[PDB]
Amino acid sequence: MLRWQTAGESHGEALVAMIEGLPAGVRISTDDIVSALARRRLGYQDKVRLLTGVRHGLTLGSPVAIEIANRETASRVALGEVAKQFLDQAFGIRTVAHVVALGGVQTNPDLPLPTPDDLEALDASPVRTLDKEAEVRIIERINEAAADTLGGVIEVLAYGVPAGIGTYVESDRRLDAALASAIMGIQAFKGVEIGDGFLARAGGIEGGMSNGQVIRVRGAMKPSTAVPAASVVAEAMVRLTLAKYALDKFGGDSVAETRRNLESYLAS
Amino acid sequence: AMLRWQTAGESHGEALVAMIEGLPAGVRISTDDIVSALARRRLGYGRGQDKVRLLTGVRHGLTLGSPVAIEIANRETASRVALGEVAKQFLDQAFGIRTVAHVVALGGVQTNPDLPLPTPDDLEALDASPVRTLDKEAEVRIIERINEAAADTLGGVIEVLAYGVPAGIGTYVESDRRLDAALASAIMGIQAFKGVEIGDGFLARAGGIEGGMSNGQVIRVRGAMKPSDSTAVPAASVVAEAMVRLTLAKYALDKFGGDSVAETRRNLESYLAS
Amino acid sequence: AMLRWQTAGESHGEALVAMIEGLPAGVRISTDDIVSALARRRLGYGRGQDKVRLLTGVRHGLTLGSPVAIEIANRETASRVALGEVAKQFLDQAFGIRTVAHVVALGGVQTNPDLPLPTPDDLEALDASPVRTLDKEAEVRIIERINEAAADTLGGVIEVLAYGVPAGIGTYVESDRRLDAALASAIMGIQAFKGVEIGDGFLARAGGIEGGMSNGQVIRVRGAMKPSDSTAVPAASVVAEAMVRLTLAKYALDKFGGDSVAETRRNLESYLAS
Amino acid sequence: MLRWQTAGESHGEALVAMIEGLPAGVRISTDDIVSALARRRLGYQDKVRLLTGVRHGLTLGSPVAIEIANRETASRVALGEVAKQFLDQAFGIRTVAHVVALGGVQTNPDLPLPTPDDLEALDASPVRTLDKEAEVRIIERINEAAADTLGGVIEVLAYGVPAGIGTYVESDRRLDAALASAIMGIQAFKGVEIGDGFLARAGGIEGGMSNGQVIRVRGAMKPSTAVPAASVVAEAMVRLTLAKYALDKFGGDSVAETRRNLESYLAS
Ligand SMILES: [Cl-]
Ligand SMILES: [Cl-]
Ligand SMILES: [Cl-]
Ligand SMILES: [Cl-]
Ligand SMILES: [Cl-]
Ligand SMILES: [Cl-]
Ligand SMILES: [Cl-]
Ligand SMILES: [Cl-]
């Protein structure tokens, strides 16, 4: 079972993150993590060590512990980076995060959904959106406001998820249940939807199981603005939950065995 | 032992079975209580009896502290509603916690938010309403809206409110163990639910949970669902109530413990004296 | 979902109830199988009927994949023995794993270790023996020993053997998740048990588990217990067998999975082809 | 719930141990841990950092992570040291570990049981026993043997445990069940007993619950000798299980609240 723990005080010598149950063969580097941490600072000099579980840039199958030199989101974002690598390398699964509403201003829903290829443009946007018209209105609104007190709605999309991850049983063990819980557990979040949700299309989860479509998770939040950073942190938690459920369903001891189990299932 | 439960049964086998472990000795519970809560899951506006046995864990009308197994005669929601009736009796007797469920929107037709929140004393009236709301005005539009539609295909929004929850249940740690996270999970795990809010979230007020923990105010949980010939939404609210109760029972039991309703009651009384 | 089980019932209430979740569809199981396994828990040398319902999870004699609830008519060991009968049928049908239980010592009187180990084909003979051993010589001394004693106060050592377990079940990681650790826990959690060995441990042979994992040999688990007018030891062996089976079912299900006995069987067949 | 994880490769830059759910107020230092690690080397230059969860020599209530600079038992022994501090400071509970048989030679059971005050004498004994007659026979036997292949039986005693920790319910959640599992999960162990066990007085656990007596746990093992080190490692795991169960039964958020909950229960 993929399991993780974080540690470290706002003003201490280090933050520690530890993840267990990841298979051997995942390519992960400290520069990957430094890069993932920089992204958390974005919105209108991190040092990382991989202490255990890695040799020659690959996971070994043992527990991976990360030391980050410095409330904090760093350690969760670091874990999300490891989860990101694993999901892509083992399954072709990739996520995207963006802000779809901030301070009451909505983005245009008729516009194309962002994709993983839009990552550079989203990092470049001060409020993490491709909707250039909404962005300038959001910026105006931020400037009329203190900044970190404004609310918003964020969205995380997951591509390449194969159908069949989750359970048909009605319980918190369903995939939409686990995701809803992962988001709402983030400070400031007050709501979560799968797809159109309250507006109701399914958002890629139907009857507790992924259906093969894009998974669209939205989180409402209400506590220099904090909304873009929240989208990034939420992406980390969505990645971790997705990694956990995908590994439970197709898990092998090495990334190569894991793909091999995906191709088997997918060929029947 | 954490409060833990399980259900079983096929929609056309002889019986449905529900089991719950971790409940303290001394909860006052009867088959009658359950037959009653089961009746309510059938209410709902349309346009076109239950037998219960307490197989284990109860003696002389009171829980023993051991696992309680319930046989309900015969997807099903009965075993969960039954379970919520047991949680209801525990919450009220040990903590004076009571919940209420109502439909705040159905098929696009919203109710009026200004109207005062329903309270537990409004139960009989809520059961009497075909669409489970106190908004007479809205009830007629919703009925109109159902009539112009197949009924059970319409979705809506439900609300569950919890009165009397003391402050300090849940945790500051940002994780799954937060009370708001567990409730989101409890709702979202019910078939057809696509959304969940604490307070007026997507529009916002904390809804009684701040920083992962109950603050003493009324707790408000909303859920959006979208699936004779009746609508499914009022019943969804009754099921959501069942799961909110179970979660609240679990978390309250964890904080105030006790091997008996009396001891649990004393631990709360003690905690509130600081 | 991990194989998971729960029992309930009071020693003088209407029924005992046992429930097990996570079992694959297609296990062949009948009330009859259970009445039978329940009869065996009563065997034991002395000096001075069961009704079973499969309330859920079974249709046309086969498991459905959903939770299985069992009502046994009426401390008790019946619900665990019932549960072990279900695990027995699963183990044998999905993996060809079968177990045997026997008493290797009682009241200080040891059996002879040189004699060949009992096999599953020795069941009928083991049931026929008042002290559940194939050591005719020892059986008479034990009976002698019981006679010179209150019978149920005498302790002893029991052994459970598991044939056909494939290699690779459990883990290398030094923790609770090792197969030998889980079995130690399964036994030690039974009332009166004070000791547990894998193989000939205290005297030593691996007993089929090395480095936290099954190696393909026969698995051997020993347990030391010390509490008409019969001895309790032969029945303890039957209960220990029930818990060893459940643990083995859990761990095997975790490694070979499958939503059906057929699919699980194919995953093992696949694993053994490397 | 007291929860711990360990990480680190036999030949890597560090070993990491992390423990969560410990209350604020436990006095613990890196010198305590260095000392506990030295004890593991004993039998016929460790550097430790407390990365998180501690300030002014006291736990804060958050997760405690430990870095140890170097199969390994170091990280478990480190966790046992933290567990030791907590158990003594919160409950007056203290443990002892010793070898009661090695290579077939038995110690004298008529002799006084060791106590926590016997710690210096036990560390000083090359085979961890107060039975001086048995010790020289054990040493002879070791010398007649390769050394690390000899088996033995170890014992861990726990003093000051209050009656009532565990459960009467027949399951692996009983205290004797949890302890049996903690020992047997250690490599090389093949058997565990509570009290006289197979010999059968109760060894301090009756009907799944501690009874107020001394808890006596024995572990049979069969893989320069390794038996004394195994006794120390087993003590670490017994400490952790005891800490976990005691905290579940009387746990408060600070050591002071925890004692206070013990005195309450104990006064009724
Ligand atoms: Cl990407
Ligand atoms: Cl907004
Ligand atoms: Cl609606
Ligand atoms: Cl009471
Ligand atoms: Cl004996
Ligand atoms: Cl099948
Ligand atoms: Cl000490
Ligand atoms: Cl020995």
Swiss-Prot record, chains B, C:
Q: In terms of domain of life, where is this protein from?
A: Bacteria
Question: Keywords in UniProt for this one?
Answer: Amino-acid biosynthesis, Aromatic amino acid biosynthesis, FAD, Flavoprotein, FMN, Lyase, NADP
The reaction(s) catalysed by this protein are: 5-O-(1-carboxyvinyl)-3-phosphoshikimate = chorismate + phosphate
InterPro entries linked? Chorismate_synth, Chorismate_synth_AroC_sf, Chorismate_synthase_CS
A molecular function (GO) held by this record is: FMN binding
The biological processes this protein is annotated with in GO are: amino acid biosynthetic process; aromatic amino acid family biosynthetic process; chorismate biosynthetic process
Q: SUPFAM superfamilies, from UniProt?
A: Chorismate synthase, AroC
Pathway assignment reads: Metabolic intermediate biosynthesis; chorismate biosynthesis; chorismate from D-erythrose 4-phosphate and phosphoenolpyruvate: step 7/7
The answer, when asked if RNA-binding is one of the entry's keywords, is no
Q: What does the cofactor section's free text say about binding?
A: Reduced FMN (FMNH(2)).
Binding positions for FMN per the UniProt entry: Q191, A192, G211
Per UniProt, the enzyme's principal EC class comes to lyase
GO cellular component terms, alphabetically, are: cytosol
Q: What is its EC number?
A: 4.2.3.5
Could you say which residues bind NADP(+) here? R41, R47
Leader sequence residues: none
Pfam families referenced in this protein's UniProt entry, alphabetically = Chorismate_synt
Which coenzyme or cofactor does it need?
A: FMNH2
| CDD domains to which the protein is assigned, alphabetical | Chorismate_synthase (cd07304)
What family is reported? Belongs to the chorismate synthase family.
| Function description | This reaction introduces a second double bond into the aromatic ring system.
* Quaternary structure (record): Homotetramer.
Q: What is this protein called?
A: Chorismate synthase
Species annotation: Bifidobacterium longum subsp. infantis (strain ATCC 15697 / DSM 20088 / JCM 1222 / NCTC 11817 / S12)
Q: What is the lineage of its organism?
A: Bacteria, Bacillati, Actinomycetota, Actinomycetes, Bifidobacteriales
Q: Which gene encodes it?
A: aroC
